[PDB]
Amino acid sequence: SQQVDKIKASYPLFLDQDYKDMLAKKRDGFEEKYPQDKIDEVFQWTTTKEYQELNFQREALTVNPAKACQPLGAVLCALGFEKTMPYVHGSQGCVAYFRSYFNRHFREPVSCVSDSMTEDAAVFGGQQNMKDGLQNCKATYKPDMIAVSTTCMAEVIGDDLNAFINNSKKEGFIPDEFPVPFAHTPSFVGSHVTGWDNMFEGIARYFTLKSMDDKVVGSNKKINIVPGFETYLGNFRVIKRMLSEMGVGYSLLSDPEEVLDTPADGQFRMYAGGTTQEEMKDAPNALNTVLLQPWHLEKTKKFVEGTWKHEVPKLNIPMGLDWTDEFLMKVSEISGQPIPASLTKERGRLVDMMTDSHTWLHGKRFALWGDPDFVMGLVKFLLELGCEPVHILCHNGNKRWKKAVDAILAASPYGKNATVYIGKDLWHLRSLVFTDKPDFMIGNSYGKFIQRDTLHKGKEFEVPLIRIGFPIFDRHHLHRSTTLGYEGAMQILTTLVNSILERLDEETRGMQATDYNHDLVR
Amino acid sequence: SQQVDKIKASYPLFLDQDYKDMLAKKRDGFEEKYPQDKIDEVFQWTTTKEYQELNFQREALTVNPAKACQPLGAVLCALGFEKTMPYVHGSQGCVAYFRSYFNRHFREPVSCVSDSMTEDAAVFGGQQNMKDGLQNCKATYKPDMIAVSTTCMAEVIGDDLNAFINNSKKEGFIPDEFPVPFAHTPSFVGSHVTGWDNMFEGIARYFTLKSMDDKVVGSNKKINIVPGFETYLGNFRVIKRMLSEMGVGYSLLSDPEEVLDTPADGQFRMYAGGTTQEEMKDAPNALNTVLLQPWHLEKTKKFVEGTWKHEVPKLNIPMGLDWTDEFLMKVSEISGQPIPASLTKERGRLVDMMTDSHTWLHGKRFALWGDPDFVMGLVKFLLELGCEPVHILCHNGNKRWKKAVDAILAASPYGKNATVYIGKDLWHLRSLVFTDKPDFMIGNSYGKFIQRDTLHKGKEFEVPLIRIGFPIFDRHHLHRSTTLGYEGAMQILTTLVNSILERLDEETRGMQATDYNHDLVR
Amino acid sequence: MSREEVESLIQEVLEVYPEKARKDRNKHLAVNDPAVTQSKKCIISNKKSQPGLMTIRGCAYAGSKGVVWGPIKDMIHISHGPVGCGQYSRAGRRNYYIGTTGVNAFVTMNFTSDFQEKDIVFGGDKKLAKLIDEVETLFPLNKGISVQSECPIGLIGDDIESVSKVKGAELSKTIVPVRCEGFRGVSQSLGHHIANDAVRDWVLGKRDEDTTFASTPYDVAIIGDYNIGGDAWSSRILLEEMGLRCVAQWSGDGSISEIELTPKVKLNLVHCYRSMNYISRHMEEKYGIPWMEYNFFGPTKTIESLRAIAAKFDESIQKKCEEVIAKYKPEWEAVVAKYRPRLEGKRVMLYIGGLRPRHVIGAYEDLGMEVVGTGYEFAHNDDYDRTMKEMGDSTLLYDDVTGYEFEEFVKRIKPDLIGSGIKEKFIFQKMGIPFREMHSWDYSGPYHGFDGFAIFARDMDMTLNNPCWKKLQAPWE
Amino acid sequence: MSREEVESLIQEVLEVYPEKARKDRNKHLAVNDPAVTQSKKCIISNKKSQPGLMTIRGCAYAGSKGVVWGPIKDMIHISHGPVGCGQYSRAGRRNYYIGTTGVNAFVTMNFTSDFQEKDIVFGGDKKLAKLIDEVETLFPLNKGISVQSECPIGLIGDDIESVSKVKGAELSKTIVPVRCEGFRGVSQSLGHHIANDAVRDWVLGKRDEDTTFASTPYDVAIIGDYNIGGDAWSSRILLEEMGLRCVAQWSGDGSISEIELTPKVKLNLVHCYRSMNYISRHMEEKYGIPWMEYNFFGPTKTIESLRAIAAKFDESIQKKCEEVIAKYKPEWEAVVAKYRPRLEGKRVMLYIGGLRPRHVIGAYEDLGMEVVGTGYEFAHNDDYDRTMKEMGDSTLLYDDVTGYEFEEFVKRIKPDLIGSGIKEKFIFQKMGIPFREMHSWDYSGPYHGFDGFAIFARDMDMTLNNPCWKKLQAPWE
Numbered sequence A, B: 001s002q003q004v005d006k007i008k009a010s011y012p013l014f015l016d017q018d019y020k021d022m023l024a025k026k027r028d029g030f031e032e033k034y035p036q037d038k039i040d041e042v043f044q045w046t047t048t049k050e051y052q053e054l055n056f057q058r059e060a061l062t063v064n065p066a067k068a069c070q071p072l073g074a075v076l077c078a079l080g081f082e083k084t085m086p087y088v089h090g091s092q093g094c095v096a097y098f099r100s101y102f103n104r105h106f107r108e109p110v111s112c113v114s115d116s117m118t119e120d121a122a123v124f125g126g127q128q129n130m131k132d133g134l135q136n137c138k139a140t141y142k143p144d145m146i147a148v149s150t151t152c153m154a155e156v157i158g159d160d161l162n163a164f165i166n167n168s169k170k171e172g173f174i175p176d177e178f179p180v181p182f183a184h185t186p187s188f189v190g191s192h193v194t195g196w197d198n199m200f201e202g203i204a205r206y207f208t209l210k211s212m213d214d215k216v217v218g219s220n221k222k223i224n225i226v227p228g229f230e231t232y233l234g235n236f237r238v239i240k241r242m243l244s245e246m247g248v249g250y251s252l253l254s255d256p257e258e259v260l261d262t263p264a265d266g267q268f269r270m271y272a273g274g275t276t277q278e279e280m281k282d283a284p285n286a287l288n289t290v291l292l293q294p295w296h297l298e299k300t301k302k303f304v305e306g307t308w309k310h311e312v313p314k315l316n317i318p319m320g321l322d323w324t325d326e327f328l329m330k331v332s333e334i335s336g337q338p339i340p341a342s343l344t345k346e347r348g349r350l351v352d353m354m355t356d357s358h359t360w361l362h363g364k365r366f367a368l369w370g371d372p373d374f375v376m377g378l379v380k381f382l383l384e385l386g387c388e389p390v391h392i393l394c395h396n397g398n399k400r401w402k403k404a405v406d407a408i409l410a411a412s413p414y415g416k417n418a419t420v421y422i423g424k425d426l427w428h429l430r431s432l433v434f435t436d437k438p439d440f441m442i443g444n445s446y447g448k449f450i451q452r453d454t455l456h457k458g459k460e461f462e463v464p465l466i467r468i469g470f471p472i473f474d475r476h477h478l479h480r481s482t483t484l485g486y487e488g489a490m491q492i493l494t495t496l497v498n499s500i501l502e503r504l505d506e507e508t509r510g511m512q513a514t515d516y517n518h519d520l521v522r
Numbered sequence C, D: 001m002s003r004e005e006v007e008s009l010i011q012e013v014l015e016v017y018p019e020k021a022r023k024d025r026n027k028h029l030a031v032n033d034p035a036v037t038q039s040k041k042c043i044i045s046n047k048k049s050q051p052g053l054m055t056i057r058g059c060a061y062a063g064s065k066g067v068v069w070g071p072i073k074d075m076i077h078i079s080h081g082p083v084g085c086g087q088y089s090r091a092g093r094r095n096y097y098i099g100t101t102g103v104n105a106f107v108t109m110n111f112t113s114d115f116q117e118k119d120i121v122f123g124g125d126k127k128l129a130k131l132i133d134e135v136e137t138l139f140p141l142n143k144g145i146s147v148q149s150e151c152p153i154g155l156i157g158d159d160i161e162s163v164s165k166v167k168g169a170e171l172s173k174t175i176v177p178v179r180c181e182g183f184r185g186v187s188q189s190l191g192h193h194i195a196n197d198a199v200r201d202w203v204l205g206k207r208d209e210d211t212t213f214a215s216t217p218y219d220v221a222i223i224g225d226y227n228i229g230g231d232a233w234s235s236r237i238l239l240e241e242m243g244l245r246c247v248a249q250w251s252g253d254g255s256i257s258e259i260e261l262t263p264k265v266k267l268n269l270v271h272c273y274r275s276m277n278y279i280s281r282h283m284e285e286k287y288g289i290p291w292m293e294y295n296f297f298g299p300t301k302t303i304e305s306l307r308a309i310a311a312k313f314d315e316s317i318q319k320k321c322e323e324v325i326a327k328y329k330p331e332w333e334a335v336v337a338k339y340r341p342r343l344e345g346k347r348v349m350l351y352i353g354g355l356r357p358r359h360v361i362g363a364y365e366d367l368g369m370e371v372v373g374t375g376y377e378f379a380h381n382d383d384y385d386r387t388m389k390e391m392g393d394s395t396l397l398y399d400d401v402t403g404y405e406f407e408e409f410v411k412r413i414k415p416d417l418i419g420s421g422i423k424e425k426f427i428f429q430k431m432g433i434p435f436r437e438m439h440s441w442d443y444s445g446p447y448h449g450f451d452g453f454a455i456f457a458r459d460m461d462m463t464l465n466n467p468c469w470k471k472l473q474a475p476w477e
């Protein structure tokens, strides 16, 4: 039953007495459900240490992973170029999933096509599919460039993208001068960041490999910036703004912030902004190339140093105080431009915020997960704040990255109790946050369920989640935040200190029980 | 008892069994406390309409007010000028309280002096105090200008600031050329915004009243901006950014963002930035003057129209979508500069954010309180989002402001169930949210206690608080936020939608009870 | 309206395509004529998509794991293959359920094999067996395992049926191998077919010899309702207020025991014909259980379906049906009285998957709203038949529309409201036309039944009449 | 060390002041000589502040309402006058208490008269009576009312004593009029005196003829402890573990009944001598109750005070005291062992109101830390007599320091850590010197007792050794 003046959605309409009775009757009559005491006992067993030992012995089963497949990153990289259509050679269900994922994270339209390979292509290949798809895409959506990636179907089959595109141009499906860069993105190798790296290396190769004769390093007096797999528009904005204050000529490669933040004024813009073809062609003439996320841009770095002959600096991600300072000083050395007074003022303001919040930030324990560079930068920033990381998880990390993170943790007294896990999923982290309870978690939306589990063990065992990373589905417009630079550091510090204060306020809101510590001033 | 490895602060150390026993023994033996059932009965009575009728019949008792006294606003206004020392002619307790209040809100040093009037000054006046204080302040802190306000002691006594300052200059305590503007700020009239208005009018009079002969309107091709009582640095930052994006020459009067956001680089800066004396002297030459908060800048408006001969536009506070558009169009008309494409893109992005969040924003009920202009702008923005304001409270509002707010509410179908209260304090608002429960409250930190009371009635009756306004003591770095303009509208929308989403996530976190609606995608 | 104008629009939109694409896409768009019963003469459906045209269709894995098998709560479903498919489909559908997640319910959890290059080169049957052992060790309260295959499994020489047989014999557990590779078929329809075949072959007949279940003359089973936003629940209560006993619901908030008990019911109430018609026909053939379609979208369709269902039973059920209708009449009458004046005269264009595009027209018509265009992603001509009678005269019908075609059709027709998926929501919101997600109910609901009608009307009013749609054009332009 | 350079520093700082200001401020700064016990010959205190020098002192209203009367939980305290005074002092002090706020506790609530121009021109006695009636109507469970006066009340000539007498006779309620106008005196010390006089005249003698309270030879009363961050609680438990009965607690977590029962105790343990010495001396004259000072900052002072207190009772109390010391020895020994190595050798400068500047030195030396400078806002000469014997040789002493003087002294001396109020916290944090709020414990605590020693040591380590202090200089600067 519903009241017209107060209509109730599923919650709390299904908490009515009649709905409760109907659910109870269903469960007691036809579900054959296990007894409640058995369920409670099994849950308690899953929260224990022996269950953790059983869980960490897994070799073949992955539960609740924390990564995706390469073509997603390839599509994200392709979306960062001007009037460029991402084109995945393979099955359609993949592109549907990619578009749904990116639509949910960004709340913005995502454009991506496929050649819709079916069972017949499982025995003859997707050459006809590639020809017809390229012709149809160029005729319908009119892109300046088509960037081709692959799914697992085409990778396992063995489809040769180079020969297929060459045959499409000869026969006459697409003009010969039309730029069609391609990259192989097997989903069973690496993760989405590897796909981003492969797509960018393919585009750079296509645009610069056969015209290096007239390129001279430092001709245009610019610096190339490769941001990698990035899902915060504020990061692109802050990088551009910092390079603008310094008066440093720069060329951002694969800039998707314009196409992922189009205004709603009555028209739908399929394309907006992005790196131009001339920028890619003139890239070898830059003074140097700076990679913002070096731990998933290894193939790009190999191509840049091998072909463009650019001495790529060994720079960490510009995350937090020390690494932002190092990045700014390296940029100043490369470009010869002094660091202005505005950036020093902003750094001083960040230091002032750190000194203001150090009392509440000191000694807190955080589990965290995400991408390698983001996780390492967040760990460094937490160490700079006096916080104690305990569970550091990266499903798509490797042994060298783990060694680097261990070296970072060993240099700080606050990394004594920290442990780094690579190849572990979110079920492993549930066991860890149960058996060794931290104060908070830092991760994407998928952590919310973990929080729920902790709340089932008790209020004193609940581990609240802080949504920093990709993807965030249960909150709105958090993709507009900034994470790199001083501004990103300020935002992260504010988020952390305010989450701590909110948790303290909640724990001390019981009147005559715990409200003696419900202080007005904190 | 304490564990060396895990040390507890007051919470939850006083929840230990021994402390609980000691507190129970104390209460049972020597406190003569009322029985718990009587306390529960009286609380339940205080949450009814019968109590609300008794509460709203109050004529002489104010409980938990939502305003401060004039010299605080005068000090804030004086802090916005270059190398200016706020000087309160009266008792030192006022200055100590002002400095503590502003330090707690801004987490930054606040400079303000007093002449320390005592009972002897209550018998013979405070002329000698004024002379000695002016000389001592100029000799010690070396300001370019001293801005003098008053406390209730000097106001009741009848101290004449003009004669006292004139005598200080002749006798030779301060040079004659030294600028010493003054303003009377009686704490029993109006509130802190009235003090800001009085201080600004006094400074403008001092700098422009006796030199209007050579002033010609529109000579310098600039627009004066008077921001009023403002405690968000982002508001100052956003107004200047939009005016520069427009290429409009402007002169911001009383700009305190520099002195309230000094960097921490190892040196203490007593003064930083601020409006210069030359800007104040050249103000009459501007094309026009724009008041950002016209409802507490009435004296300033009278002085500007009467003396400077500026036709002050009838502009509301640039809050939300419509009023920001009106302010930008008025600025474009006054200056002649067209509105650039960047501001149109920002407006379109705000509209896109609105369309994305409208499903969760629609139909929510908010009680809110604060300053008149801020409350009216927030009400307008809530009406633009489809939200329903129910309890609109402004302690320092007047009948004409209430009429204007009623006219705004009557123009929208969402303001049907809205009531405006002027002269009511936060105890009235507690009664209102108990008898007519809204979904959320929007106000300063003082609302937190109200929330606690609601939680005592039950979880289903709890009304969460959203901290927007002045002062915010229990959260860090929220004074850096933006409220005016498209950026402020985006920040407010994000805060509202995310508070709604967090409340929904909390209400549906119970496993096998309400976690069926614990959706990953929202 | 103006059939010739709509035909001119169709040709104008078709001009941009190449010759082959034009010829293929001309058959998938049509004008509606309510008199014509056979849609094969006007519209062609269930065909492969044109490459590079940004279609909205999914894959067979989405149809099988995401739609049919996923809502089953007490079973564990393994996305056998690389890691992407399970990650993108995890907790993206709002099939509601009641259980302790991670202990005895696993709907929102993502189990995957996480295939690497070695598993591709050398196969993954041993990895599958080890994974099954690990699942048994760490999740003892699971009541069955399904293995949903992805593209590499079909591509490489992997034989998961023998692994499932051996492990099910070893652990005395029900393991259902589903050959739901994404490259099979052209859309999720073949995924629905494969999942239905798996249910028939491995789960349905496990209690054929068992007679321990006490049956009652009023036994019905809900088939094809996936409890989106609690929808199935809002239906089930009505069926229990009629005096009927609902033994099973497929598959939202469903259990393996309910599927096993389904062949013991007296009637099969099928909600989604497209996905469960195969299993309904099989149950009718093998057990003699009659099945019937029902619609609970809006008060009119709800009342008609309730009376049709009660007609299949004795007089007492009909009396209770009349009592239920009389009880619920004032509520939906009040909802209509409150919300129809704000919604009368509005025009709607829809594009959903197999069933909803023709099932929701009744509620919209009850609120005084007219549907001018409709279409399907993966429906067959049988569905288009029903729709042609269901839909209005001189109205637009589209099958497997592309992004460009859909955008042009909306730009020309200019409806007041659009109902489609997440991949067109923001596109159409940028153009200034109110949009409602017709798949996940825009994270609202339920919409079935009298209780769901109030939520449907409230959502329609809140989106159609939102002030934000009046603010796209800046005052200075 | 180096007294001569400290004197040179004092003269160099004093050079900038004008003539009269120089000669007045020269008397308030001194070098410490532990041998000299008469500080009158060395330092002058309790004098009016120089105008326009940005002093840190408060007002008599802050000393009365904020400090003494405010922590009383079951009484309603009305700031009679304009609104700002009660607005700025609301919930700013962390006097902890246990109660139902708004029903039977009112500490964090702000009751005010909200005087306007009319109440200034025509007085506010009738408004005061109306306010008292409304307070009685809306807060029936309050057990007392206090009326704290502000500057306009004393300036316009309001007779609040007559109103209090009449309304107390009318409603049979205890109404205490406090003449704590801010222009009286030079600091909060006169506010403490006035509040003590009000307690003496209106509350203390209400049970002089009442003898129904059963008394014990181990009855004690804690006076001058305001339960900052729970400090008083962490003291009282220790007194409970010695076998002593604590009947009263002034004034943190205090009730009017406890104040009434105070004259029935056998000993008055005074924590803050500065604020409650008046009431202690009176209760020794009118009732014969002896009083003693005690210190619970740090394990050494805690143990010394515990033994001194137990010395006043029989042998059983001494045995219980020894048991308590033996029980709590390992805890503070572990705290010392963990935190002394990180804090040894550090130097501290302090500036707090009237008691802490000499009470915390013991804990600071217990953690191996040296105090080089100390001072007071509103202390008298006996406080400096007490301080001189506890403070280092040739160390700095300052009374009512100004902002410029304090900044110059810290800039020259360069200590490792500073303890002061909120108005210097950010000033000294911007100069890169670790700062601890010595008034509110930086929203931490408690610091009294063995339990508070662990928190104090942990806070000192977390602030003094925070990495943020190493990042103030940019690497390119």
Ligand code: ICS
Pocket (backbone or CB within 6 Å): D063, D067, D093, D188, D226, D228, D272, D274, D275, D352, D353, D354, D355, D356, D357, D438, D439, D440
């Ligand atoms: S009462 Fe005094 S300023 Fe003795 S007004 Fe002040 S809670 Fe200080 S040094 Mo804040 S004479 Fe108490 C004090 Fe000491 S408020 Fe507290 S810390 S021991």
Ligand code: CLF
Pocket (backbone or CB within 6 Å): A069, A070, A071, A091, A092, A093, A094, A095, A097, A150, A151, A152, A153, A187, C059, C060, C061, C062, C082, C083, C084, C085, C086, C149, C150, C151, C180, C181, C182, C183
């Ligand atoms: S058509 Fe369908 S959704 Fe596509 S893969 Fe095939 S079953 Fe799956 Fe998952 S892993 Fe990534 S997204 Fe694909 S490319 Fe290899």
Ligand code: CLF
Pocket (backbone or CB within 6 Å): B069, B070, B071, B091, B092, B093, B094, B095, B097, B150, B151, B152, B153, B187, D059, D060, D061, D062, D082, D083, D084, D085, D086, D149, D150, D151, D180, D181, D182, D183
């Ligand atoms: S010395 Fe003391 S604190 Fe000062 S006023 Fe006087 S009693 Fe009070 Fe409150 S109201 Fe405002 S701050 Fe003053 S100026 Fe009039």
Ligand SMILES: [Fe+3]
Pocket (backbone or CB within 6 Å): A106, A107, A108, B352, B353, B356, C426
């Ligand atoms: Fe958007």
Ligand SMILES: [Fe+3]
Pocket (backbone or CB within 6 Å): A352, A353, A356, B106, B107, B108, D426
């Ligand atoms: Fe600060």
